[PDB]
């Protein structure tokens, strides 16, 4: 028991029970400073207006 992952080889060589938590691959990156959208003076309105 523990944090063992269920893949094809391990499941073929060792019997596994039903999963109890979701797992997957996810990339982790640092915070990137964003930029403001240009032409912000036209935001509280519409071009049709």
């Amino acid at each position: 028991v523990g944090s063992l992952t269920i893949n094809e080889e391990r499941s073929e060589v060792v019997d596994f029970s039903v999963p109890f938590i979701e797992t997957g691959i996810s990339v982790m990156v640092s915070r990137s400073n964003g930029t403001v959208s240009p032409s912000a003076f036209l935001e509280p309105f519409s071009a049709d207006v």
Partner: protein, 50 residues
Amino acid sequence: GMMGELLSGQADMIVAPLTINNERAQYIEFSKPFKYQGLTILVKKEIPRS
């Protein structure tokens, strides 16, 4: 229903969004899930007209 028709010998396999729980797995075997999900509540958009 569908599980009752399966147990009665009508069909052999089931390809449908069937969940996994204890009561249904006590009688039939379930393979590894192909998609994970959960339960939530769906309501209508408020859209305040103040």
